[PDB]
Amino acid sequence: FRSRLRKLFSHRFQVIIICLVVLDALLVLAELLLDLKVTAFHYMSFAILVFFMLDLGLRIFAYGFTNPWEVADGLIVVVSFVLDLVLLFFEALGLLILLRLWRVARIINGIIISRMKQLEDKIEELLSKIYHLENEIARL
């Protein structure tokens, strides 16, 4: 049993996770740039990266006929960034990078399909309404 996650979530936290996407973006890029050039800034980069991993994990895991494909999406995300953690063990940074870059056209998608659903809901609140008006015409 857990309710706060489903009570208060009814946003700003998403904005937070976006600014933090760009933050880890910038984290690894600044990392590899200083890798193109000194030593402990790199250490810092690794650290705040770990930060990013952990937080997205904790704040996306917290959620609790259509269940399976959702479950698939989520677990794909998961395994994505678990191999990302593995990659924290070179030009494989590339790999690593684009993996953050996956999140992007994962989240936007998990953002658009939202609207879709949401938008589709409004569509319902048009059809019936249309139907309703017909009833109110004949009538006469």
Short mmCIF file of N, CA, C and O in Angstrom, two decimals:
data_model
loop_
_atom_site.label_atom_id
_atom_site.label_comp_id
_atom_site.label_asym_id
_atom_site.label_seq_id
_atom_site.Cartn_x
_atom_site.Cartn_y
_atom_site.Cartn_z
N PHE A 1 0.81 -1.22 0.00
CA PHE A 1 0.00 0.00 0.00
C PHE A 1 0.85 1.28 0.00
O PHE A 1 1.75 1.44 0.83
N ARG A 2 0.54 2.18 -0.93
CA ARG A 2 1.24 3.46 -1.07
C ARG A 2 0.34 4.48 -1.78
O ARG A 2 -0.18 4.19 -2.87
N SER A 3 0.16 5.66 -1.20
CA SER A 3 -0.83 6.61 -1.72
C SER A 3 -0.29 8.00 -2.07
O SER A 3 -0.77 8.64 -3.01
N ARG A 4 0.70 8.47 -1.33
CA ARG A 4 1.28 9.79 -1.57
C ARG A 4 1.71 9.96 -3.03
O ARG A 4 1.49 11.01 -3.63
N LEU A 5 2.32 8.91 -3.58
CA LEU A 5 2.79 8.90 -4.96
C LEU A 5 1.65 9.11 -5.96
O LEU A 5 1.86 9.67 -7.04
N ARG A 6 0.45 8.67 -5.60
CA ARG A 6 -0.71 8.80 -6.49
C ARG A 6 -1.65 9.93 -6.06
O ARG A 6 -2.60 10.27 -6.77
N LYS A 7 -1.38 10.52 -4.90
CA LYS A 7 -2.25 11.59 -4.39
C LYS A 7 -1.76 12.96 -4.83
O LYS A 7 -2.52 13.73 -5.43
N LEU A 8 -0.50 13.26 -4.52
CA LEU A 8 0.09 14.57 -4.78
C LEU A 8 0.49 14.75 -6.24
O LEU A 8 0.62 15.88 -6.72
N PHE A 9 0.70 13.63 -6.93
CA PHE A 9 1.10 13.66 -8.34
C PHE A 9 0.00 14.21 -9.25
O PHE A 9 0.27 14.57 -10.40
N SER A 10 -1.23 14.28 -8.75
CA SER A 10 -2.32 14.87 -9.52
C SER A 10 -2.16 16.39 -9.61
O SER A 10 -1.05 16.90 -9.80
N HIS A 11 3.86 18.25 -14.45
CA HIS A 11 3.92 19.12 -13.28
C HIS A 11 5.34 19.70 -13.08
O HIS A 11 6.15 19.76 -14.02
N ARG A 12 5.61 20.12 -11.85
CA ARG A 12 6.86 20.80 -11.51
C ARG A 12 8.00 19.79 -11.35
O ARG A 12 9.14 20.06 -11.74
N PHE A 13 7.69 18.62 -10.78
CA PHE A 13 8.66 17.53 -10.65
C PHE A 13 9.22 17.07 -12.00
O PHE A 13 10.39 16.72 -12.12
N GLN A 14 8.37 17.09 -13.02
CA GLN A 14 8.80 16.79 -14.38
C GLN A 14 9.79 17.82 -14.89
O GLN A 14 10.80 17.48 -15.48
N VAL A 15 9.48 19.10 -14.65
CA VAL A 15 10.37 20.20 -14.99
C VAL A 15 11.73 19.98 -14.34
O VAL A 15 12.77 20.15 -14.97
N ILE A 16 11.68 19.60 -13.06
CA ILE A 16 12.85 19.26 -12.29
C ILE A 16 13.66 18.19 -13.02
O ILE A 16 14.84 18.39 -13.32
N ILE A 17 13.01 17.07 -13.36
CA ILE A 17 13.72 16.00 -14.07
C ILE A 17 14.24 16.39 -15.47
O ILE A 17 15.16 15.77 -16.00
N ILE A 18 13.65 17.42 -16.07
CA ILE A 18 14.15 17.92 -17.34
C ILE A 18 15.44 18.72 -17.12
O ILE A 18 16.47 18.49 -17.78
N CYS A 19 15.38 19.67 -16.19
CA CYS A 19 16.56 20.48 -15.93
C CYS A 19 17.70 19.54 -15.54
O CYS A 19 18.85 19.78 -15.93
N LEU A 20 17.37 18.46 -14.82
CA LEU A 20 18.39 17.48 -14.41
C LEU A 20 18.89 16.56 -15.55
O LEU A 20 20.04 16.11 -15.54
N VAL A 21 18.02 16.29 -16.52
CA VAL A 21 18.47 15.69 -17.78
C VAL A 21 19.56 16.54 -18.40
O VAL A 21 20.67 16.06 -18.67
N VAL A 22 19.25 17.81 -18.63
CA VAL A 22 20.27 18.67 -19.23
C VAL A 22 21.50 18.76 -18.34
O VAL A 22 22.61 18.95 -18.81
N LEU A 23 21.29 18.60 -17.04
CA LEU A 23 22.40 18.66 -16.12
C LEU A 23 23.34 17.47 -16.29
O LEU A 23 24.55 17.65 -16.29
N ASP A 24 22.81 16.25 -16.47
CA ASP A 24 23.68 15.09 -16.65
C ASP A 24 24.26 15.07 -18.04
O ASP A 24 25.35 14.53 -18.28
N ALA A 25 23.47 15.59 -18.97
CA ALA A 25 23.92 15.85 -20.31
C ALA A 25 25.25 16.56 -20.12
O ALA A 25 26.33 15.95 -20.26
N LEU A 26 25.14 17.82 -19.71
CA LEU A 26 26.29 18.67 -19.45
C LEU A 26 27.39 18.01 -18.57
O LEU A 26 28.58 18.29 -18.73
N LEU A 27 26.99 17.08 -17.70
CA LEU A 27 27.93 16.39 -16.83
C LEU A 27 28.87 15.51 -17.62
O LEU A 27 30.09 15.55 -17.45
N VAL A 28 28.30 14.68 -18.48
CA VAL A 28 29.15 13.77 -19.23
C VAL A 28 29.84 14.53 -20.33
O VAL A 28 31.02 14.25 -20.62
N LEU A 29 29.16 15.48 -20.94
CA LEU A 29 29.87 16.19 -21.99
C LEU A 29 31.09 16.92 -21.42
O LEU A 29 32.19 16.72 -21.90
N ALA A 30 30.90 17.73 -20.38
CA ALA A 30 32.04 18.40 -19.74
C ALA A 30 33.08 17.37 -19.32
O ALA A 30 34.29 17.62 -19.40
N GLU A 31 32.61 16.21 -18.89
CA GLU A 31 33.51 15.13 -18.60
C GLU A 31 34.41 14.80 -19.79
O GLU A 31 35.62 14.84 -19.66
N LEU A 32 33.83 14.48 -20.93
CA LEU A 32 34.63 14.01 -22.05
C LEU A 32 35.46 15.14 -22.65
O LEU A 32 36.53 14.90 -23.20
N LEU A 33 34.96 16.37 -22.55
CA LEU A 33 35.73 17.53 -22.99
C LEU A 33 37.00 17.68 -22.18
O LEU A 33 38.09 17.87 -22.73
N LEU A 34 36.87 17.60 -20.86
CA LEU A 34 38.06 17.62 -20.04
C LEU A 34 38.86 16.35 -20.27
O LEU A 34 40.05 16.29 -19.93
N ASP A 35 38.23 15.33 -20.85
CA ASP A 35 38.96 14.13 -21.22
C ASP A 35 39.72 14.32 -22.54
O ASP A 35 40.74 13.68 -22.78
N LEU A 36 39.22 15.22 -23.38
CA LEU A 36 39.94 15.61 -24.59
C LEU A 36 41.15 16.50 -24.24
O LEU A 36 42.07 16.63 -25.05
N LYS A 37 41.14 17.09 -23.05
CA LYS A 37 42.22 17.98 -22.62
C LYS A 37 43.27 17.26 -21.79
O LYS A 37 44.06 17.89 -21.08
N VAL A 38 41.14 18.73 -15.36
CA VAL A 38 42.20 17.79 -15.69
C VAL A 38 41.90 16.36 -15.21
O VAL A 38 41.69 15.46 -16.03
N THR A 39 41.87 16.15 -13.89
CA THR A 39 41.82 14.80 -13.31
C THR A 39 40.68 14.54 -12.31
O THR A 39 40.01 13.51 -12.37
N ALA A 40 40.48 15.47 -11.37
CA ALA A 40 39.46 15.32 -10.33
C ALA A 40 38.12 15.95 -10.68
O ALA A 40 37.10 15.63 -10.09
N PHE A 41 38.14 16.89 -11.63
CA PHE A 41 36.89 17.43 -12.15
C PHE A 41 36.15 16.24 -12.72
O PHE A 41 34.94 16.10 -12.56
N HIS A 42 36.92 15.36 -13.35
CA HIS A 42 36.43 14.11 -13.88
C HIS A 42 35.77 13.23 -12.81
O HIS A 42 34.66 12.70 -13.00
N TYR A 43 36.49 13.05 -11.71
CA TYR A 43 35.95 12.45 -10.50
C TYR A 43 34.57 13.05 -10.16
O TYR A 43 33.58 12.31 -10.03
N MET A 44 34.50 14.38 -10.04
CA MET A 44 33.24 15.08 -9.75
C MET A 44 32.13 14.69 -10.73
O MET A 44 30.96 14.50 -10.35
N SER A 45 32.53 14.60 -11.99
CA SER A 45 31.62 14.29 -13.07
C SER A 45 30.97 12.92 -12.84
O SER A 45 29.74 12.80 -12.84
N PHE A 46 31.81 11.92 -12.60
CA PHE A 46 31.38 10.58 -12.19
C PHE A 46 30.41 10.59 -10.99
O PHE A 46 29.37 9.90 -11.00
N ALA A 47 30.75 11.38 -9.98
CA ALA A 47 29.93 11.48 -8.78
C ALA A 47 28.51 11.95 -9.07
O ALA A 47 27.53 11.25 -8.79
N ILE A 48 28.41 13.15 -9.64
CA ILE A 48 27.11 13.76 -9.88
C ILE A 48 26.35 12.96 -10.93
O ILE A 48 25.12 12.94 -10.94
N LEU A 49 27.07 12.28 -11.80
CA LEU A 49 26.43 11.27 -12.65
C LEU A 49 25.69 10.19 -11.82
O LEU A 49 24.51 9.89 -12.07
N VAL A 50 26.41 9.62 -10.85
CA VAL A 50 25.85 8.60 -9.95
C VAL A 50 24.61 9.16 -9.28
O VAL A 50 23.59 8.47 -9.15
N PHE A 51 24.73 10.43 -8.87
CA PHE A 51 23.61 11.21 -8.36
C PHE A 51 22.41 11.03 -9.31
O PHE A 51 21.37 10.47 -8.92
N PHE A 52 22.58 11.48 -10.55
CA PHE A 52 21.55 11.41 -11.58
C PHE A 52 20.89 10.01 -11.70
O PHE A 52 19.64 9.88 -11.64
N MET A 53 21.73 8.98 -11.85
CA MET A 53 21.30 7.59 -11.94
C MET A 53 20.32 7.29 -10.83
O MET A 53 19.13 6.99 -11.05
N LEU A 54 20.86 7.40 -9.62
CA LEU A 54 20.10 7.11 -8.41
C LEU A 54 18.74 7.83 -8.37
O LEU A 54 17.70 7.19 -8.22
N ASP A 55 18.75 9.16 -8.54
CA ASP A 55 17.50 9.94 -8.38
C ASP A 55 16.41 9.62 -9.41
O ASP A 55 15.23 9.51 -9.04
N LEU A 56 16.79 9.50 -10.68
CA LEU A 56 15.81 9.15 -11.70
C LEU A 56 15.23 7.78 -11.36
O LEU A 56 14.03 7.56 -11.50
N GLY A 57 16.10 6.89 -10.88
CA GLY A 57 15.67 5.56 -10.51
C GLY A 57 14.62 5.59 -9.42
O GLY A 57 13.51 5.07 -9.59
N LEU A 58 14.97 6.22 -8.30
CA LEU A 58 14.08 6.27 -7.13
C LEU A 58 12.76 6.98 -7.43
O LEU A 58 11.70 6.54 -7.00
N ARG A 59 12.82 8.06 -8.21
CA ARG A 59 11.64 8.90 -8.51
C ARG A 59 10.85 8.47 -9.76
O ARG A 59 9.88 9.13 -10.15
N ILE A 60 11.27 7.38 -10.41
CA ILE A 60 10.47 6.81 -11.50
C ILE A 60 9.94 5.43 -11.11
O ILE A 60 8.84 5.01 -11.53
N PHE A 61 10.70 4.73 -10.27
CA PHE A 61 10.24 3.47 -9.69
C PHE A 61 9.01 3.73 -8.81
O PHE A 61 8.10 2.90 -8.75
N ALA A 62 9.00 4.88 -8.14
CA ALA A 62 7.87 5.27 -7.32
C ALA A 62 6.69 5.61 -8.21
O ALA A 62 6.56 6.73 -8.70
N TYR A 63 5.83 4.62 -8.44
CA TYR A 63 4.62 4.84 -9.21
C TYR A 63 3.44 4.20 -8.49
O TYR A 63 2.41 4.85 -8.24
N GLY A 64 3.59 2.92 -8.13
CA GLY A 64 2.64 2.26 -7.25
C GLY A 64 2.65 2.83 -5.84
O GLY A 64 3.24 3.88 -5.55
N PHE A 65 -6.72 -3.70 -20.03
CA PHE A 65 -6.09 -4.82 -20.72
C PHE A 65 -4.70 -4.43 -21.21
O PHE A 65 -4.04 -5.19 -21.92
N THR A 66 -4.25 -3.25 -20.79
CA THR A 66 -3.15 -2.56 -21.46
C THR A 66 -1.79 -2.59 -20.76
O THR A 66 -0.81 -2.05 -21.29
N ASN A 67 -1.72 -3.21 -19.59
CA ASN A 67 -0.49 -3.25 -18.79
C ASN A 67 0.82 -3.69 -19.46
O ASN A 67 1.87 -3.05 -19.24
N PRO A 68 0.79 -4.79 -20.24
CA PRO A 68 2.07 -5.33 -20.73
C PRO A 68 2.99 -4.33 -21.45
O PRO A 68 4.15 -4.26 -21.05
N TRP A 69 2.51 -3.57 -22.43
CA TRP A 69 3.38 -2.66 -23.20
C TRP A 69 3.94 -1.50 -22.36
O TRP A 69 5.05 -1.01 -22.63
N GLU A 70 3.18 -1.07 -21.36
CA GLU A 70 3.67 -0.11 -20.38
C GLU A 70 4.86 -0.73 -19.62
O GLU A 70 5.98 -0.18 -19.63
N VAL A 71 4.60 -1.88 -18.99
CA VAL A 71 5.65 -2.63 -18.28
C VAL A 71 6.91 -2.78 -19.15
O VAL A 71 8.04 -2.64 -18.66
N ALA A 72 6.70 -3.02 -20.45
CA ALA A 72 7.78 -3.19 -21.41
C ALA A 72 8.57 -1.91 -21.54
O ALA A 72 9.79 -1.94 -21.48
N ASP A 73 7.86 -0.80 -21.74
CA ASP A 73 8.51 0.51 -21.84
C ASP A 73 9.42 0.76 -20.63
O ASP A 73 10.65 0.98 -20.76
N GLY A 74 8.80 0.72 -19.46
CA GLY A 74 9.48 0.98 -18.20
C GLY A 74 10.71 0.13 -18.01
O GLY A 74 11.80 0.65 -17.76
N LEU A 75 10.55 -1.19 -18.12
CA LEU A 75 11.69 -2.08 -17.97
C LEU A 75 12.75 -1.86 -19.05
O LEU A 75 13.93 -2.16 -18.83
N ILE A 76 12.35 -1.37 -20.22
CA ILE A 76 13.34 -1.09 -21.26
C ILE A 76 14.22 0.07 -20.78
O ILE A 76 15.45 0.04 -20.92
N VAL A 77 13.55 1.10 -20.24
CA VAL A 77 14.22 2.24 -19.62
C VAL A 77 15.22 1.77 -18.57
O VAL A 77 16.42 2.12 -18.59
N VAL A 78 14.70 0.96 -17.65
CA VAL A 78 15.48 0.40 -16.56
C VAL A 78 16.74 -0.21 -17.14
O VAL A 78 17.84 0.31 -16.88
N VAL A 79 16.59 -1.25 -17.96
CA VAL A 79 17.77 -2.00 -18.44
C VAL A 79 18.73 -1.12 -19.23
O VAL A 79 19.95 -1.33 -19.23
N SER A 80 18.15 -0.11 -19.87
CA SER A 80 18.92 0.91 -20.56
C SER A 80 19.93 1.41 -19.56
O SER A 80 21.14 1.18 -19.71
N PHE A 81 19.44 2.02 -18.49
CA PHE A 81 20.35 2.72 -17.60
C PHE A 81 21.09 1.83 -16.59
O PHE A 81 22.02 2.27 -15.91
N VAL A 82 20.72 0.56 -16.54
CA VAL A 82 21.54 -0.39 -15.79
C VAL A 82 22.79 -0.73 -16.61
O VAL A 82 23.89 -0.82 -16.08
N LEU A 83 22.63 -0.88 -17.92
CA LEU A 83 23.81 -1.05 -18.75
C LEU A 83 24.57 0.24 -18.75
O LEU A 83 25.78 0.25 -18.98
N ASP A 84 23.87 1.33 -18.55
CA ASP A 84 24.60 2.56 -18.37
C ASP A 84 25.48 2.47 -17.15
O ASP A 84 26.64 2.86 -17.24
N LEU A 85 24.96 1.97 -16.04
CA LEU A 85 25.79 1.83 -14.86
C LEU A 85 27.00 0.89 -15.15
O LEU A 85 28.15 1.16 -14.76
N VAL A 86 26.74 -0.18 -15.88
CA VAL A 86 27.79 -1.10 -16.29
C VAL A 86 28.87 -0.36 -17.07
O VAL A 86 30.06 -0.58 -16.86
N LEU A 87 28.45 0.53 -17.97
CA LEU A 87 29.39 1.31 -18.77
C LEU A 87 30.24 2.25 -17.91
O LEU A 87 31.24 2.82 -18.37
N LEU A 88 29.85 2.40 -16.65
CA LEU A 88 30.68 3.16 -15.74
C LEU A 88 31.75 2.23 -15.18
O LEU A 88 32.04 2.27 -13.99
N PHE A 89 32.32 1.41 -16.06
CA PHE A 89 33.38 0.48 -15.67
C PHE A 89 34.43 0.31 -16.77
O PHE A 89 34.10 0.16 -17.95
N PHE A 90 36.87 6.17 -22.29
CA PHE A 90 36.88 5.52 -23.60
C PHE A 90 35.85 6.19 -24.51
O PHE A 90 35.19 7.15 -24.12
N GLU A 91 35.70 5.69 -25.72
CA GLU A 91 34.74 6.25 -26.65
C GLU A 91 33.40 5.65 -26.34
O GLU A 91 32.39 6.05 -26.89
N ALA A 92 33.41 4.63 -25.48
CA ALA A 92 32.19 4.06 -24.96
C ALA A 92 31.41 5.14 -24.24
O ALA A 92 30.21 5.02 -24.11
N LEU A 93 32.09 6.18 -23.78
CA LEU A 93 31.37 7.38 -23.35
C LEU A 93 30.24 7.76 -24.34
O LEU A 93 29.08 7.98 -23.96
N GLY A 94 30.59 7.85 -25.62
CA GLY A 94 29.61 7.86 -26.70
C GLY A 94 28.38 7.05 -26.37
O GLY A 94 27.33 7.66 -26.10
N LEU A 95 28.50 5.71 -26.41
CA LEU A 95 27.47 4.82 -25.85
C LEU A 95 26.75 5.47 -24.64
O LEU A 95 25.59 5.87 -24.73
N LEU A 96 27.48 5.61 -23.54
CA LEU A 96 26.97 6.25 -22.35
C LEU A 96 26.15 7.51 -22.69
O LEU A 96 24.98 7.62 -22.32
N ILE A 97 26.76 8.43 -23.43
CA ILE A 97 26.07 9.66 -23.83
C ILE A 97 24.73 9.39 -24.47
O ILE A 97 23.70 9.94 -24.07
N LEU A 98 24.74 8.56 -25.48
CA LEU A 98 23.55 8.44 -26.27
C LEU A 98 22.51 7.74 -25.44
O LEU A 98 21.31 7.80 -25.71
N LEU A 99 22.96 7.08 -24.40
CA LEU A 99 22.01 6.45 -23.51
C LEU A 99 21.24 7.50 -22.74
O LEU A 99 20.04 7.41 -22.59
N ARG A 100 21.89 8.53 -22.27
CA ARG A 100 21.11 9.61 -21.73
C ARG A 100 20.21 10.11 -22.86
O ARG A 100 19.00 10.31 -22.67
N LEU A 101 20.80 10.22 -24.05
CA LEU A 101 20.08 10.67 -25.23
C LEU A 101 18.88 9.79 -25.60
O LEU A 101 18.06 10.17 -26.44
N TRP A 102 18.79 8.61 -25.00
CA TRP A 102 17.66 7.77 -25.30
C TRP A 102 16.48 8.24 -24.44
O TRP A 102 15.37 8.45 -24.95
N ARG A 103 16.77 8.43 -23.15
CA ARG A 103 15.84 8.95 -22.16
C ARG A 103 14.98 10.03 -22.75
O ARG A 103 13.75 9.96 -22.71
N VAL A 104 15.66 11.03 -23.30
CA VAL A 104 15.03 12.06 -24.10
C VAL A 104 13.91 11.50 -24.99
O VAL A 104 12.74 11.54 -24.62
N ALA A 105 14.23 10.92 -26.13
CA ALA A 105 13.13 10.47 -26.99
C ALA A 105 12.55 9.12 -26.50
O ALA A 105 12.17 8.20 -27.27
N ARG A 106 12.50 9.08 -25.17
CA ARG A 106 11.68 8.16 -24.44
C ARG A 106 10.71 9.02 -23.65
O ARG A 106 9.49 8.90 -23.81
N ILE A 107 11.24 9.93 -22.83
CA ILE A 107 10.37 10.80 -22.02
C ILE A 107 9.43 11.66 -22.87
O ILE A 107 8.23 11.66 -22.62
N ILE A 108 9.94 12.34 -23.90
CA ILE A 108 9.05 13.10 -24.79
C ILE A 108 7.95 12.21 -25.31
O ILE A 108 6.82 12.63 -25.49
N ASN A 109 8.26 10.95 -25.54
CA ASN A 109 7.25 10.08 -26.09
C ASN A 109 6.25 9.78 -25.01
O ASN A 109 5.04 9.91 -25.19
N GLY A 110 6.77 9.42 -23.84
CA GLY A 110 5.92 9.22 -22.68
C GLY A 110 5.25 10.53 -22.30
O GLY A 110 4.44 10.54 -21.39
N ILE A 111 5.61 11.62 -22.99
CA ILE A 111 4.95 12.92 -22.84
C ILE A 111 3.89 13.13 -23.92
O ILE A 111 2.83 13.73 -23.66
N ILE A 112 4.16 12.66 -25.13
CA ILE A 112 3.20 12.92 -26.18
C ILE A 112 2.03 11.95 -26.06
O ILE A 112 0.89 12.37 -26.18
N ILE A 113 2.31 10.68 -25.78
CA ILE A 113 1.24 9.67 -25.71
C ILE A 113 0.26 10.08 -24.62
O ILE A 113 -0.97 9.91 -24.76
N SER A 114 0.81 10.64 -23.54
CA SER A 114 0.02 11.33 -22.56
C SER A 114 -1.00 12.22 -23.26
O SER A 114 -2.19 11.85 -23.33
N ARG A 115 -0.54 13.35 -23.81
CA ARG A 115 -1.42 14.29 -24.51
C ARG A 115 -2.41 13.50 -25.33
O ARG A 115 -3.58 13.77 -25.28
N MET A 116 -1.93 12.46 -26.01
CA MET A 116 -2.75 11.69 -26.92
C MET A 116 -3.98 11.22 -26.17
O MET A 116 -5.09 11.66 -26.47
N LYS A 117 -3.74 10.35 -25.19
CA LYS A 117 -4.73 9.95 -24.21
C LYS A 117 -5.54 11.15 -23.77
O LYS A 117 -6.75 11.21 -24.00
N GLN A 118 -4.86 12.12 -23.18
CA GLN A 118 -5.55 13.30 -22.71
C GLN A 118 -6.38 13.92 -23.84
O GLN A 118 -7.58 14.16 -23.68
N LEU A 119 -5.74 14.13 -24.98
CA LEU A 119 -6.40 14.72 -26.13
C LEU A 119 -7.59 13.84 -26.55
O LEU A 119 -8.70 14.32 -26.78
N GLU A 120 -7.36 12.53 -26.57
CA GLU A 120 -8.42 11.62 -26.97
C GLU A 120 -9.61 11.75 -26.05
O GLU A 120 -10.76 11.62 -26.47
N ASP A 121 -9.33 12.02 -24.78
CA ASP A 121 -10.40 12.14 -23.81
C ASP A 121 -11.33 13.29 -24.23
O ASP A 121 -12.55 13.12 -24.26
N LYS A 122 -10.72 14.42 -24.61
CA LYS A 122 -11.48 15.58 -25.07
C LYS A 122 -12.28 15.20 -26.30
O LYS A 122 -13.40 15.66 -26.47
N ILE A 123 -11.70 14.35 -27.14
CA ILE A 123 -12.36 13.95 -28.37
C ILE A 123 -13.69 13.32 -28.00
O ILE A 123 -14.71 13.59 -28.64
N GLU A 124 -13.69 12.52 -26.93
CA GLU A 124 -14.93 11.89 -26.47
C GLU A 124 -15.94 12.98 -26.12
O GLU A 124 -17.07 13.00 -26.63
N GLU A 125 -15.48 13.93 -25.31
CA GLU A 125 -16.25 15.10 -24.90
C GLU A 125 -16.50 16.05 -26.07
O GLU A 125 -16.67 17.26 -25.87
N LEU A 126 -16.49 15.52 -27.28
CA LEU A 126 -16.89 16.28 -28.44
C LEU A 126 -17.93 15.41 -29.13
O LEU A 126 -19.05 15.86 -29.38
N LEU A 127 -17.59 14.15 -29.34
CA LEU A 127 -18.46 13.25 -30.10
C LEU A 127 -19.88 13.19 -29.53
O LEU A 127 -20.85 13.56 -30.19
N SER A 128 -19.96 12.74 -28.28
CA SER A 128 -21.22 12.66 -27.56
C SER A 128 -21.91 14.00 -27.64
O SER A 128 -23.11 14.06 -27.93
N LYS A 129 -21.15 15.07 -27.39
CA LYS A 129 -21.73 16.41 -27.34
C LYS A 129 -22.39 16.68 -28.67
O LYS A 129 -23.55 17.12 -28.73
N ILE A 130 -21.67 16.36 -29.75
CA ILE A 130 -22.23 16.46 -31.08
C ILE A 130 -23.52 15.65 -31.13
O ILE A 130 -24.60 16.20 -31.40
N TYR A 131 -23.40 14.36 -30.83
CA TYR A 131 -24.55 13.49 -30.69
C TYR A 131 -25.65 14.18 -29.87
O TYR A 131 -26.79 14.28 -30.33
N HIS A 132 -25.29 14.75 -28.71
CA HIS A 132 -26.27 15.41 -27.84
C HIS A 132 -27.09 16.46 -28.60
O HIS A 132 -28.33 16.46 -28.54
N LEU A 133 -26.40 17.31 -29.34
CA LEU A 133 -27.05 18.41 -30.05
C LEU A 133 -28.05 17.89 -31.07
O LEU A 133 -29.09 18.52 -31.30
N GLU A 134 -27.74 16.75 -31.68
CA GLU A 134 -28.64 16.16 -32.66
C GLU A 134 -29.97 15.85 -31.98
O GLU A 134 -31.05 16.15 -32.51
N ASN A 135 -29.87 15.30 -30.77
CA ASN A 135 -31.06 14.97 -29.98
C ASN A 135 -31.88 16.22 -29.68
O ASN A 135 -33.10 16.16 -29.52
N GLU A 136 -31.19 17.36 -29.62
CA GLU A 136 -31.82 18.62 -29.27
C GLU A 136 -32.27 19.37 -30.51
O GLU A 136 -32.69 20.52 -30.43
N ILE A 137 -32.18 18.72 -31.67
CA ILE A 137 -32.69 19.34 -32.90
C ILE A 137 -33.97 18.64 -33.35
O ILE A 137 -34.95 19.29 -33.75
N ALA A 138 -33.97 17.31 -33.27
CA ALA A 138 -35.17 16.55 -33.59
C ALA A 138 -35.45 15.50 -32.51
O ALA A 138 -34.88 14.41 -32.57
N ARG A 139 -36.30 15.80 -31.51
CA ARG A 139 -36.94 17.11 -31.24
C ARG A 139 -37.90 17.69 -32.28
O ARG A 139 -39.02 17.19 -32.46
N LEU A 140 -37.47 18.75 -32.94
CA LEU A 140 -38.32 19.40 -33.93
C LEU A 140 -38.06 18.82 -35.32
O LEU A 140 -36.95 18.37 -35.60
#
